[PDB]
Amino acid sequence: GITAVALYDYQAAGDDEISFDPDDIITNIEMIDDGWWRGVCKGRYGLFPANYVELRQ
Amino acid sequence: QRNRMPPPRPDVGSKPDSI
């Protein structure tokens, strides 16, 4: 059970990367890339901007 | 100033050779 919250609003510049909202918290966010991450939003897998988002758990 | 511009994006294609 993983959860991540975005500090600001970001827009993914790739088909594999997705965007999220500050209040909109996602789950299943694990650290895969030294600069990027990967989470799951209601069954939506993608990349999380480590520069705009942050891993809670 | 009172406002601050957004932070830069991480290097997705570019990466350092060392730590």
**Which domains are present in chain A?**
3-55 (2.30.30.40)
Residue B9 C-alpha, separation from nearest chain A C-alpha, in angstroms: 6
Tell me the helix, strand and coil percentages in chain A, rounded to 5: 0, 45, 55
Test A35 with B8 for CB contact under 8 angstroms: no
Test B10 with A52 for CB contact under 8 angstroms: no
Beta carbons within 8 Å of A41's beta carbon, 6+ residues apart:
A18, A20, A24, A26, A27
Cα–Cα distance measured from residue A20 to residue B4, given in angstroms and rounded to the nearest whole number = 21
CA distances from B13 to A34, A39, A56, B10 (A): 12, 20, 26, 9
